[PDB]
mmCIF file of C-alpha atoms and ligand atoms in Angstrom:
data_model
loop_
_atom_site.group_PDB
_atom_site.id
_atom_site.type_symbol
_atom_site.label_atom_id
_atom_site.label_comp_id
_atom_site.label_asym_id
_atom_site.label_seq_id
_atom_site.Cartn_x
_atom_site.Cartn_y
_atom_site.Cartn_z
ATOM 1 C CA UNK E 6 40.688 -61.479 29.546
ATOM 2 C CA UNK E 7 38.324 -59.548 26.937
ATOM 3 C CA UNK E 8 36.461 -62.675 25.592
ATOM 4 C CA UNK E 9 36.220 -64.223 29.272
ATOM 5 C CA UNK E 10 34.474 -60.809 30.380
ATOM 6 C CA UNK E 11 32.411 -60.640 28.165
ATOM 7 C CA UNK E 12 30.959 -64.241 28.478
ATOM 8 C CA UNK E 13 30.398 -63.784 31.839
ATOM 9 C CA UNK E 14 28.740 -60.306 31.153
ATOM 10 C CA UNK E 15 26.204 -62.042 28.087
ATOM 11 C CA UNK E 16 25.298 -64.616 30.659
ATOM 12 C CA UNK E 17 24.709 -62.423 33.926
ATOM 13 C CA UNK E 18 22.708 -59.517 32.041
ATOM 14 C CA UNK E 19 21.243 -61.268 29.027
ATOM 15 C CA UNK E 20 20.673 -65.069 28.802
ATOM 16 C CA UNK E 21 20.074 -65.859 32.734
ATOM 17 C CA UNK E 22 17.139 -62.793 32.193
ATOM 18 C CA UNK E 23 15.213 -63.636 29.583
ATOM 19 C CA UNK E 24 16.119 -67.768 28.871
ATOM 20 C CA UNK E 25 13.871 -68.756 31.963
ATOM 21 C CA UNK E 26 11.214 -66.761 30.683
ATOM 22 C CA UNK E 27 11.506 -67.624 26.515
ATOM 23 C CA UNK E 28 9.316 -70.612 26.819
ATOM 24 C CA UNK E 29 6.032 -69.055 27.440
ATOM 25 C CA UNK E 30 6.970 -66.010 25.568
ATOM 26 C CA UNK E 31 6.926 -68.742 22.479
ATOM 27 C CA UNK E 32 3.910 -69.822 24.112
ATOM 28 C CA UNK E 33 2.145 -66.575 23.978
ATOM 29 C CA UNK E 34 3.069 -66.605 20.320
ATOM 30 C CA UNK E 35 1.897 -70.168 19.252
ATOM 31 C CA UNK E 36 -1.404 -69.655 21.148
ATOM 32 C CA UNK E 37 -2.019 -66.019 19.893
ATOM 33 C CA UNK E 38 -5.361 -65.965 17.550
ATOM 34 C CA UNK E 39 -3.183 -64.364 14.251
ATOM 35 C CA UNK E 40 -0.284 -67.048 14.609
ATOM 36 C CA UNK E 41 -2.337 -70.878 14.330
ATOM 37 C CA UNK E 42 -2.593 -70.386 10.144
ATOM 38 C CA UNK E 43 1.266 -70.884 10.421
ATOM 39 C CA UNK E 44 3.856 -73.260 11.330
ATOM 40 C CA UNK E 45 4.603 -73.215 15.317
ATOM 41 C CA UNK E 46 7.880 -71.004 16.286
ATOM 42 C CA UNK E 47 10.325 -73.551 17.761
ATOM 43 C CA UNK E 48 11.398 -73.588 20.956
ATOM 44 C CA UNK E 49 14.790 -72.343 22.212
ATOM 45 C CA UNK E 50 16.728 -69.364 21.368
ATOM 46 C CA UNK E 51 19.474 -69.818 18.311
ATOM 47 C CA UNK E 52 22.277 -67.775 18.905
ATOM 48 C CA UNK E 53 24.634 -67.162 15.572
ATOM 49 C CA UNK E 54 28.471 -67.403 16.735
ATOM 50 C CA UNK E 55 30.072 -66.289 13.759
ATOM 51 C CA UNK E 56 34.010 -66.982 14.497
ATOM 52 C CA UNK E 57 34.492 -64.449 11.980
ATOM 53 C CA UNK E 58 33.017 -62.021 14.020
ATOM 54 C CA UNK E 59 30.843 -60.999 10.818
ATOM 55 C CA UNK E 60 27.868 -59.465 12.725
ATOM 56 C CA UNK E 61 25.394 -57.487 9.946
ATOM 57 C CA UNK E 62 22.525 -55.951 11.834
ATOM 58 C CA UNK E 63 19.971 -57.321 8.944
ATOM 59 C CA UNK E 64 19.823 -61.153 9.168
ATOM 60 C CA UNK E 65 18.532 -60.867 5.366
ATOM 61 C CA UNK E 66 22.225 -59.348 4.593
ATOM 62 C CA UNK E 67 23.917 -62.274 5.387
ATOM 63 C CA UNK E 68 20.829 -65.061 3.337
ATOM 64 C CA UNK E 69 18.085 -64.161 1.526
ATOM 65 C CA UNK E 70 16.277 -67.552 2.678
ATOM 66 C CA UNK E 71 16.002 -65.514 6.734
ATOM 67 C CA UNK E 72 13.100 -63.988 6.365
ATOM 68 C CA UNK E 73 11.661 -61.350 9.295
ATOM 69 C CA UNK E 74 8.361 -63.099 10.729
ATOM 70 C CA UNK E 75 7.381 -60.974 13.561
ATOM 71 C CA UNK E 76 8.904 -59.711 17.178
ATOM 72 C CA UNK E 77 7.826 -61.953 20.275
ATOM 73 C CA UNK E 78 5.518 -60.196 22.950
ATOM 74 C CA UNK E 79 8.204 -57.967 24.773
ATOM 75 C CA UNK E 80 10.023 -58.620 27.918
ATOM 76 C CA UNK E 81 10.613 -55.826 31.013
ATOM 77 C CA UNK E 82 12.329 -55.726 33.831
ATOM 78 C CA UNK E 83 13.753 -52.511 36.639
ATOM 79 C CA UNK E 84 17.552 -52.739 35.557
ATOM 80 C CA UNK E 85 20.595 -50.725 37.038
ATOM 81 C CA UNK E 86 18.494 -47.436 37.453
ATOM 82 C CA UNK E 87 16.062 -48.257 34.500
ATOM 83 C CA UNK E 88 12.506 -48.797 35.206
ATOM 84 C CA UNK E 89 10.602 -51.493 32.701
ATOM 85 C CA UNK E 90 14.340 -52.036 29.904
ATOM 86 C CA UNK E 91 13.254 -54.032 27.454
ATOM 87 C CA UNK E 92 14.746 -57.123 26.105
ATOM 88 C CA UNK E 93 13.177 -57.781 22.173
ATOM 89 C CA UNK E 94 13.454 -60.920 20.561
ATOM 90 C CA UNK E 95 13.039 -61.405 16.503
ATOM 91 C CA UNK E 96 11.249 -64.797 14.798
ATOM 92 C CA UNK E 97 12.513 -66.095 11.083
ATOM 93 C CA UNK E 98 11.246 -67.921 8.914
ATOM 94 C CA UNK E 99 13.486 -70.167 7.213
ATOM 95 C CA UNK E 100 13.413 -70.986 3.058
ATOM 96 C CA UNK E 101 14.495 -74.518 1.315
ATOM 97 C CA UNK E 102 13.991 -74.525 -2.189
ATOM 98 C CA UNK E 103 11.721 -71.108 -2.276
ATOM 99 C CA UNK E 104 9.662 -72.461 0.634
ATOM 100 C CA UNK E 105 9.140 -72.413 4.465
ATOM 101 C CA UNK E 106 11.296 -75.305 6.150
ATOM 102 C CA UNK E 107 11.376 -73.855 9.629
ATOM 103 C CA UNK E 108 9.927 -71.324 12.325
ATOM 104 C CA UNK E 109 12.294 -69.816 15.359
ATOM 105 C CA UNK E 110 13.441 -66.956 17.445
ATOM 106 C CA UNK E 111 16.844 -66.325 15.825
ATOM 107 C CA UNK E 112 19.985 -63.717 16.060
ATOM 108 C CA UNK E 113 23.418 -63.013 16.995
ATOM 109 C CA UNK E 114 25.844 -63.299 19.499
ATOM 110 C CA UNK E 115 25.851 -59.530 20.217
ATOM 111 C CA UNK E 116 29.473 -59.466 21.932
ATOM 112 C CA UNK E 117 30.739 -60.574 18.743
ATOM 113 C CA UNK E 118 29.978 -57.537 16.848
ATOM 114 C CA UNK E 119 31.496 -55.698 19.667
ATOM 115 C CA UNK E 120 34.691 -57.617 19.421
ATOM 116 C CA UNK E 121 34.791 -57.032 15.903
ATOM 117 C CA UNK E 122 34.530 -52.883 16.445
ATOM 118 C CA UNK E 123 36.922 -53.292 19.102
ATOM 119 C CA UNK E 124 39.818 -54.116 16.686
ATOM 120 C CA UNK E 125 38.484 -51.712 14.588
ATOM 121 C CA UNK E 126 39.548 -48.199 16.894
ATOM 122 C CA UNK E 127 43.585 -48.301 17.555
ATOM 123 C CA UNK E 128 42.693 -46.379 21.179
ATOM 124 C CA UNK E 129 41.500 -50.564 21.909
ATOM 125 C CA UNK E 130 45.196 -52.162 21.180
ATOM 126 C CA UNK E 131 43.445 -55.104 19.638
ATOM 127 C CA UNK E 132 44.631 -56.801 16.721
ATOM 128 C CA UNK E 133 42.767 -58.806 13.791
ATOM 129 C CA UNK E 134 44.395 -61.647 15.903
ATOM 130 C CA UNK E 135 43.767 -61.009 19.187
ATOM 131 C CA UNK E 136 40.069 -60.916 17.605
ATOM 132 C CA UNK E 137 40.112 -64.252 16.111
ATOM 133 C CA UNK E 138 41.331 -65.694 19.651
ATOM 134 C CA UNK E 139 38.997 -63.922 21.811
ATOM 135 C CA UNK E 140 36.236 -64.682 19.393
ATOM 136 C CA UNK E 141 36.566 -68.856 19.983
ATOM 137 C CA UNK E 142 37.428 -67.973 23.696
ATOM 138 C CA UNK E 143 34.202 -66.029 24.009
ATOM 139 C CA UNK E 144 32.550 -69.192 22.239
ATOM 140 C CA UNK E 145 34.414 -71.572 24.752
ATOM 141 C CA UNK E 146 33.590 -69.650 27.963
ATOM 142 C CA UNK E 147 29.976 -69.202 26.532
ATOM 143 C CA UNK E 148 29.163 -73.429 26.031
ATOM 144 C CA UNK E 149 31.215 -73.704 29.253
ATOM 145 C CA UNK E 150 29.072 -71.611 31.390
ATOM 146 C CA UNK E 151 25.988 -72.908 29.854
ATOM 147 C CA UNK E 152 26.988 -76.633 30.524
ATOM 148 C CA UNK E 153 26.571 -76.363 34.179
ATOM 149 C CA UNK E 154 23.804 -73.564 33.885
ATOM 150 C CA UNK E 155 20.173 -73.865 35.547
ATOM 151 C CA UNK E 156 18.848 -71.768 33.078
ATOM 152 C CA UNK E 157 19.765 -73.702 29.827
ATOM 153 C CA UNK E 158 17.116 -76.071 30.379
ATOM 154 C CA UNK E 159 16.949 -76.792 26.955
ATOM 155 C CA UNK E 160 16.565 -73.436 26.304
ATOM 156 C CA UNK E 161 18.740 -72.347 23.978
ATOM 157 C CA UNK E 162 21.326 -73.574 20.966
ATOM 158 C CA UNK E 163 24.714 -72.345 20.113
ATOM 159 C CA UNK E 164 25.423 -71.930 16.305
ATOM 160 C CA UNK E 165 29.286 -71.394 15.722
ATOM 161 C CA UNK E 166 30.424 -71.356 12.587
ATOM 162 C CA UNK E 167 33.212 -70.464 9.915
ATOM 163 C CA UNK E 168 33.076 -69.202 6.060
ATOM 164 C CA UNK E 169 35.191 -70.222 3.331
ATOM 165 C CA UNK E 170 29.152 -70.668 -0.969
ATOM 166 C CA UNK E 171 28.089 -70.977 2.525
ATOM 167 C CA UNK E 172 24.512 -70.798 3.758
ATOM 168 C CA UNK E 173 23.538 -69.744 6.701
ATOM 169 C CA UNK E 174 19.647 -70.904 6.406
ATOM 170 C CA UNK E 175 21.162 -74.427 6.127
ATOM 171 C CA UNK E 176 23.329 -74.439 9.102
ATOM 172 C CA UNK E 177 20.148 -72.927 11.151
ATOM 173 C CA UNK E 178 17.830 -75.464 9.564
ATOM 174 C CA UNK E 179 20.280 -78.409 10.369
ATOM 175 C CA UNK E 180 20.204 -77.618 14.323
ATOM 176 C CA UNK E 181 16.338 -76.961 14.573
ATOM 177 C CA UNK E 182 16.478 -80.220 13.076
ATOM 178 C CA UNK E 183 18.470 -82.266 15.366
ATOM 179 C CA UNK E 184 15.391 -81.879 17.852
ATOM 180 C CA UNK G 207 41.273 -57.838 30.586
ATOM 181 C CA UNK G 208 37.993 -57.988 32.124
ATOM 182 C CA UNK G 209 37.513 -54.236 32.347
ATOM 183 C CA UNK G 210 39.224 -53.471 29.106
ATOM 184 C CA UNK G 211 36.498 -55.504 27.119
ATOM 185 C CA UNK G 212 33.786 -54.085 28.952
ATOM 186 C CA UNK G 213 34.605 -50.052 28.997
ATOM 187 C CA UNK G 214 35.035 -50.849 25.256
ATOM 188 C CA UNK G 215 31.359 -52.795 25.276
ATOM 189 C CA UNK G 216 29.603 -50.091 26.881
ATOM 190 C CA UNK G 217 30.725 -47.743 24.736
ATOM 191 C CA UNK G 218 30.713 -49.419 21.166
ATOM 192 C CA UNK G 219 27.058 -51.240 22.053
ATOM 193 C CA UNK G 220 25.450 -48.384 24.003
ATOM 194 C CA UNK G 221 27.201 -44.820 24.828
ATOM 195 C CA UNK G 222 28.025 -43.852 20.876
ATOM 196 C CA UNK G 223 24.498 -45.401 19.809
ATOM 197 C CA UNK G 224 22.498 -43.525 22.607
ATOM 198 C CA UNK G 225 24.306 -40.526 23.255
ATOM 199 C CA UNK G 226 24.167 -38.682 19.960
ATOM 200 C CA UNK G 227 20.232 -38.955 19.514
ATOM 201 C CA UNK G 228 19.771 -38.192 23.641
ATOM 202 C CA UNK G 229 19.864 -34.085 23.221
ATOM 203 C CA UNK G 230 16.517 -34.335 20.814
ATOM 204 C CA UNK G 231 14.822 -37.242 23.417
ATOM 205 C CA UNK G 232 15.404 -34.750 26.392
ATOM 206 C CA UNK G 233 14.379 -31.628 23.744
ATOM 207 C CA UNK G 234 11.100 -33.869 22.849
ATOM 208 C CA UNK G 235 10.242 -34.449 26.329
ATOM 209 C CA UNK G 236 11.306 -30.697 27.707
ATOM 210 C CA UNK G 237 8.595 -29.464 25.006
ATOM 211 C CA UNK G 238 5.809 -32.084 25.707
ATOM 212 C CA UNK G 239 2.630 -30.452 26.635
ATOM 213 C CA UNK G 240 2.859 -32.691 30.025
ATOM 214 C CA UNK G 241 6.289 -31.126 31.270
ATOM 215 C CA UNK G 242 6.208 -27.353 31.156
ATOM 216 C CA UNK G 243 4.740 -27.147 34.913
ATOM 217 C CA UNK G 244 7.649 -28.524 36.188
ATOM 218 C CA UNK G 245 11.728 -28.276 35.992
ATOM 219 C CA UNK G 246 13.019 -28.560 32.720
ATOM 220 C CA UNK G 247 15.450 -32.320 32.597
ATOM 221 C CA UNK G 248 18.753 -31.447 32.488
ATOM 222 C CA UNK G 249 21.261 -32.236 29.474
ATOM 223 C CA UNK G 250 23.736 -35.012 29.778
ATOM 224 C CA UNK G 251 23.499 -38.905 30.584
ATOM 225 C CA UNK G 252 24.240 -38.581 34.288
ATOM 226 C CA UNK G 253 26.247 -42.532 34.874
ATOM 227 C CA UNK G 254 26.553 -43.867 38.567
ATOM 228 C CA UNK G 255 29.824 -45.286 39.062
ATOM 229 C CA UNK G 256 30.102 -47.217 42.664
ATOM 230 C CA UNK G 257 33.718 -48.641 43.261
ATOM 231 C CA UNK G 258 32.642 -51.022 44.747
ATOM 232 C CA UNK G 259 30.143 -52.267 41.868
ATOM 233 C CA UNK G 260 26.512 -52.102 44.590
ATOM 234 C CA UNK G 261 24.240 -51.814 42.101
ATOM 235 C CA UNK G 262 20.805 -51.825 43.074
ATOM 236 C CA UNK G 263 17.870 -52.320 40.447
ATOM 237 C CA UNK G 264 16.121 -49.299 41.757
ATOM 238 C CA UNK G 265 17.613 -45.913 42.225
ATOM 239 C CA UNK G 266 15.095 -45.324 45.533
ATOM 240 C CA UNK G 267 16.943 -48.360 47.363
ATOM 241 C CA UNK G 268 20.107 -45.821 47.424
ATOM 242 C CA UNK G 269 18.607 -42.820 48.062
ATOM 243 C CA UNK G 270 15.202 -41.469 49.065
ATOM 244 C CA UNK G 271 15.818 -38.288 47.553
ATOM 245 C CA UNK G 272 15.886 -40.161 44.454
ATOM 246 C CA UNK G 273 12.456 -40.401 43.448
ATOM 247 C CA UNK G 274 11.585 -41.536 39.960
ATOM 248 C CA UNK G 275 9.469 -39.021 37.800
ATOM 249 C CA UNK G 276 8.831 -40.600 34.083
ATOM 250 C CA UNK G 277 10.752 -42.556 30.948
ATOM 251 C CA UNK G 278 12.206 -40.248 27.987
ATOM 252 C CA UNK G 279 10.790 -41.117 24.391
ATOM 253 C CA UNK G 280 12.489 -44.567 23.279
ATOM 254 C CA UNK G 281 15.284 -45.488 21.063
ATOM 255 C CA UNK G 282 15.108 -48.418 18.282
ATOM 256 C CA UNK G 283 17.418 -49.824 16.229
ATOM 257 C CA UNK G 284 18.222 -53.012 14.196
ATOM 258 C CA UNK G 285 20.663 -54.714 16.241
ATOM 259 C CA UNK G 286 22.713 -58.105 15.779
ATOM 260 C CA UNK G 287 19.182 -60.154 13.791
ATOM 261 C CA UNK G 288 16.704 -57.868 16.707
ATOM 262 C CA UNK G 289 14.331 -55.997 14.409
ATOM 263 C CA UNK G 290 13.965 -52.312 16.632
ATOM 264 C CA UNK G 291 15.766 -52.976 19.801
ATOM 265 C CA UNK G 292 15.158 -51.098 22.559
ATOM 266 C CA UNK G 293 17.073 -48.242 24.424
ATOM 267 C CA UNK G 294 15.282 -46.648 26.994
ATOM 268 C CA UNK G 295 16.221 -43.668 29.780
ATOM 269 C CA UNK G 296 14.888 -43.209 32.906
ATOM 270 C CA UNK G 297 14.188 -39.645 34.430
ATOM 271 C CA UNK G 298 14.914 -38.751 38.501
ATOM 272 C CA UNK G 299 13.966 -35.733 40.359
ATOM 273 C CA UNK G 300 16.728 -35.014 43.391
ATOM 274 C CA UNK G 301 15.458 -33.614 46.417
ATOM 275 C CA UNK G 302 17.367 -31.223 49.242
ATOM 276 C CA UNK G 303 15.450 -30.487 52.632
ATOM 277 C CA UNK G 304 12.392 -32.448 51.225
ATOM 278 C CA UNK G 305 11.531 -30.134 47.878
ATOM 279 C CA UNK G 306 12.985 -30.832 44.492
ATOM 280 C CA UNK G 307 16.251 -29.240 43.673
ATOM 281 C CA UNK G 308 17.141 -31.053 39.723
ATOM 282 C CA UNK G 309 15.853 -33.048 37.388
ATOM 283 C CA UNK G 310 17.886 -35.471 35.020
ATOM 284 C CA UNK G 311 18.339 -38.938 33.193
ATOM 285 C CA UNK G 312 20.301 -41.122 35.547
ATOM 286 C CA UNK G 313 21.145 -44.685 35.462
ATOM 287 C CA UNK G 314 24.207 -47.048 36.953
ATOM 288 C CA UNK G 315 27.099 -48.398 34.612
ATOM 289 C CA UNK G 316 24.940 -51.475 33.880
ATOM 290 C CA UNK G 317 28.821 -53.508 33.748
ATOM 291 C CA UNK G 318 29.699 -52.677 37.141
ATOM 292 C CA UNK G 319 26.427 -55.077 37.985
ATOM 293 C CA UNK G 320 28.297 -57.941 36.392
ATOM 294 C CA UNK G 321 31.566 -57.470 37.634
ATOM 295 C CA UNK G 322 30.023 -58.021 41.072
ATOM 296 C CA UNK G 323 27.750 -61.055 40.130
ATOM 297 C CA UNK G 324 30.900 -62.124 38.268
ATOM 298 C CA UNK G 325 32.838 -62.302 41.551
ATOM 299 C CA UNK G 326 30.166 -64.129 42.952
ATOM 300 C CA UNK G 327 30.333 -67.064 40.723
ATOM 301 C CA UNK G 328 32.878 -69.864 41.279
ATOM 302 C CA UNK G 329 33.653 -70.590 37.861
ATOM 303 C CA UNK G 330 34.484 -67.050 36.793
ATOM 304 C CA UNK G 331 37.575 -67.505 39.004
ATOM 305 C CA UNK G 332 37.095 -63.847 39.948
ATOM 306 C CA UNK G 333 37.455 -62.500 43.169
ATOM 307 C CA UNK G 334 36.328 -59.688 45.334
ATOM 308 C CA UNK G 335 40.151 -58.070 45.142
ATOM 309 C CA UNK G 336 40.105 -58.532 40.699
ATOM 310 C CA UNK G 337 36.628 -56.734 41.184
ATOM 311 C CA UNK G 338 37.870 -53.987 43.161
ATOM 312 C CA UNK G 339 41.006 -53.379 41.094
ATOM 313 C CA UNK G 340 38.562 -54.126 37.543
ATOM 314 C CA UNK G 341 35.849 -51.816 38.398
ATOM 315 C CA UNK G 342 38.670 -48.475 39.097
ATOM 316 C CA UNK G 343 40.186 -49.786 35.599
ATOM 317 C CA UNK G 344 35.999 -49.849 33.770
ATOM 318 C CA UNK G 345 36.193 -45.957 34.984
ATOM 319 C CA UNK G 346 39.681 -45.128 33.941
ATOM 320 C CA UNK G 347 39.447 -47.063 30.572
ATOM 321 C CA UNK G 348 35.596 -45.222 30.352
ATOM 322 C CA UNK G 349 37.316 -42.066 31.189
ATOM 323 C CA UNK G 350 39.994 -42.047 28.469
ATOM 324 C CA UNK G 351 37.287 -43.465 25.132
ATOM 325 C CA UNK G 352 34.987 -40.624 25.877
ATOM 326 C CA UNK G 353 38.052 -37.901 26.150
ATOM 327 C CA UNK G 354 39.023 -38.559 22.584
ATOM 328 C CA UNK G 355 35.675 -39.290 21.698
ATOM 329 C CA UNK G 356 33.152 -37.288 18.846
ATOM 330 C CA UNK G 357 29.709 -38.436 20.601
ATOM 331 C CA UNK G 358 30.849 -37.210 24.172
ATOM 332 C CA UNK G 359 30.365 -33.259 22.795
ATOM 333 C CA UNK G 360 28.896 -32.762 26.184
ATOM 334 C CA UNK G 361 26.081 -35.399 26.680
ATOM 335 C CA UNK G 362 27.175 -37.110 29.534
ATOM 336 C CA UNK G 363 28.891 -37.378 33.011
ATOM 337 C CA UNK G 364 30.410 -39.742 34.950
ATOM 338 C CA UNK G 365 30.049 -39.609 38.618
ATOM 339 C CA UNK G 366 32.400 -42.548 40.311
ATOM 340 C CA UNK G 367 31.993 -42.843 43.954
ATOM 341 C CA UNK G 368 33.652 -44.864 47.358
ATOM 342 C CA UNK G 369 31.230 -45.602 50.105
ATOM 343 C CA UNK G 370 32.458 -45.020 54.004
ATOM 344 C CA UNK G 371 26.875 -41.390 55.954
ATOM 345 C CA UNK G 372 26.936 -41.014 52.321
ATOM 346 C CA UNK G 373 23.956 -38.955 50.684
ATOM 347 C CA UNK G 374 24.453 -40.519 46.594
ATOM 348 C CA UNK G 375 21.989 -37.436 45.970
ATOM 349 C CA UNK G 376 24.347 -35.250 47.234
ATOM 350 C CA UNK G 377 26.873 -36.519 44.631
ATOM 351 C CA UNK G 378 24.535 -36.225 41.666
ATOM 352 C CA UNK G 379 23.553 -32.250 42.607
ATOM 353 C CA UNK G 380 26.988 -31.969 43.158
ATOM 354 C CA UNK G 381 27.505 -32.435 39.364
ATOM 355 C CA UNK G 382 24.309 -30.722 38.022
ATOM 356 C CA UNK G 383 25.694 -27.527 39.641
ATOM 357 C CA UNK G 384 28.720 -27.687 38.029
ATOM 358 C CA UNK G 385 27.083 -26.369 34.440
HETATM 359 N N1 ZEV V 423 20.816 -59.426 22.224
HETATM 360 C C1 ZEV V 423 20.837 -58.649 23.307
HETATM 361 N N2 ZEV V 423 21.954 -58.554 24.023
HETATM 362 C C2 ZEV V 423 21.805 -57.802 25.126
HETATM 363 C C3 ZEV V 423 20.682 -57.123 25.551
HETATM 364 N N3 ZEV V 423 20.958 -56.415 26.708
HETATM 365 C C4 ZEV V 423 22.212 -56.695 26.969
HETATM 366 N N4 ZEV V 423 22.779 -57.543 26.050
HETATM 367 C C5 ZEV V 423 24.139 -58.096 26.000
HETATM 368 O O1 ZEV V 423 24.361 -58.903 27.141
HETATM 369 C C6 ZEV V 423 25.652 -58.590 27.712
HETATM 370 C C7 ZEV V 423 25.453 -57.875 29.017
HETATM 371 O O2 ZEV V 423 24.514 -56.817 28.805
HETATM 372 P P1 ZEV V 423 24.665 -55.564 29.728
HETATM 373 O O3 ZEV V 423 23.452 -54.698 29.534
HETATM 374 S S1 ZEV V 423 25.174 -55.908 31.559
HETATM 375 O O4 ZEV V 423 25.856 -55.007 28.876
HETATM 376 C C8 ZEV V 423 25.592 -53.877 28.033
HETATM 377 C C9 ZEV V 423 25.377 -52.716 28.973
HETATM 378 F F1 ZEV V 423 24.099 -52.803 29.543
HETATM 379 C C10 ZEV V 423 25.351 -51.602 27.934
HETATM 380 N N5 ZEV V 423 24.003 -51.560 27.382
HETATM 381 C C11 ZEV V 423 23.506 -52.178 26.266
HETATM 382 N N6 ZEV V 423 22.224 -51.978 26.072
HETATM 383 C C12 ZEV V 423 21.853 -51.176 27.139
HETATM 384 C C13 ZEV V 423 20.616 -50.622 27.532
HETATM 385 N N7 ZEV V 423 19.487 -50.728 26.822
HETATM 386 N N8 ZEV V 423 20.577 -49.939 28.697
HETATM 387 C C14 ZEV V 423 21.695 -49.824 29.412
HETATM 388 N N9 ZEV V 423 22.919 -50.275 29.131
HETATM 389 C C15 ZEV V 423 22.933 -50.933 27.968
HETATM 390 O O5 ZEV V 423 26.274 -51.990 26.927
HETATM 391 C C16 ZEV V 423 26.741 -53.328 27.216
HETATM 392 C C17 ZEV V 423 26.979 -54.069 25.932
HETATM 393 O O6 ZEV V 423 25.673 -54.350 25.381
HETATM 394 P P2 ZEV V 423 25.549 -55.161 24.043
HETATM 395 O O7 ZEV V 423 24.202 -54.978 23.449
HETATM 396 S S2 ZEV V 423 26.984 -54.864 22.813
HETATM 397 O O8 ZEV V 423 25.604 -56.583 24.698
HETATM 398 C C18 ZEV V 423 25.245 -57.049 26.012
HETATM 399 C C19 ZEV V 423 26.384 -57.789 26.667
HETATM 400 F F2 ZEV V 423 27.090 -58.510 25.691
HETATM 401 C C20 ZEV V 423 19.486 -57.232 24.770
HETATM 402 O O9 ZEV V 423 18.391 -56.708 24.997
HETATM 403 N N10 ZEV V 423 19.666 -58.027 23.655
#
């Protein structure tokens, strides 16, 4: 199926590259000689699973309390024919009550927005409801593969959620919390 | 399917973001004070297609006469929460008796890669005859986006291939001579 493709595909050429090697990326960070006068970046990558499929490029167009911090130190690697890709990674501050609550590396479930575009071109044959299936299927497959994965070594945490005022800084805030 | 969500992945996440800024990347680099002693880089994203999904990291572990000469300028965008993501191109000179013969940005189908680590994997429940029949239906569903699509206006070629010796160098000047 579409979503179970593209689980599979998110795994294989995205988290299985660059999870394993997050941890002293962070480290770099929390160590470097312009970071100390601030709050440590958590560890783990938080992935945003909207079921909605509501992907905005901006994470300050979906709260104003996700503020850009700063990119980590880059990642490269020889893939399919390109020498040195790189694989970027964005840190956010997060606001409660006008102030900084919490530090981490922070974005989207990039499949999601692709789903979403999918439905969007009639050439696909996907429906608004085939989308809302395949987006909790890609969800499913996702925690599935990562529950008997080697490389989610506490790693990384998945953030679905659904909206109905909703904030988004809150739902991030209550899973860097939980650690 | 499998293929279905992926043709449509690699197209809405990379192909129509890359391809309609690649003329002025190759233009920036054909002009660069560095270049003008050699061969100008062809137009067009030239995209290895293997049947049966080998995809090596490096282009040289194919073909000798596939030796890597430099990276175009890089692409960044904003994508899914990743402040300027990166999109980068790789440029190959081809070789025929030993002396260079054309010059162009080539890379694999990054997806065929994953269908084959996919088959691999016991819980993708995938096997070696789904990633046979997936990868012709990746080309074929490839092959009919870009023929109705606005951001193929001539900036790239596919080049799908079958394995029986086989000279992948061959194949690619093959296709350069065509224009
Ligand atoms: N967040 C993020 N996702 C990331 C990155 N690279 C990947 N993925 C994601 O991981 C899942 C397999 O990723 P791959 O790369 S096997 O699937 C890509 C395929 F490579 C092609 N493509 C995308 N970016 C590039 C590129 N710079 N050079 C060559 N091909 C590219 O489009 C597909 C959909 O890509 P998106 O971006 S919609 O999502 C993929 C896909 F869902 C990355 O750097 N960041």
């Amino acid at each position: 199926n579409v979503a179970h493709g593209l689980a599979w595909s998110y795994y294989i050429g995205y988290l299985r590259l660059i999870l394993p090697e997050l941890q002293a990326r962070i480290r770099t960070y929390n160590q470097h000689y312009n970071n100390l006068l601030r709050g440590a970046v958590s560890q783990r990558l938080y992935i945003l699973l909207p079921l909605d499929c509501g992907v905005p490029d901006n994470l300050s167009m979906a709260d104003p309390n996700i503020r850009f911090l700063d990119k980590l130190p880059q990642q490269t690697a020889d893939r399919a024919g390109i020498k040195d890709r790189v694989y970027s990674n964005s840190i956010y501050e997060l606001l409660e009550n006008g102030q900084r609550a919490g530090t981490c590396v922070l974005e989207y479930a990039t499949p999601l927005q692709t789903l979403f575009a999918m439905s969007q071109y009639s050439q696909a044959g996907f429906s608004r409801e085939d989308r809302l299936e395949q987006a909790k299927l890609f969800c499913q497959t996702l925690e599935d593969i990562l529950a008997d994965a080697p490389e989610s070594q506490n790693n990384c945490r998945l953030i679905a959620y659904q909206e109905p005022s909703f904030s988004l800084s809150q739902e991030v805030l209550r899973h860097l919390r939980q650690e």
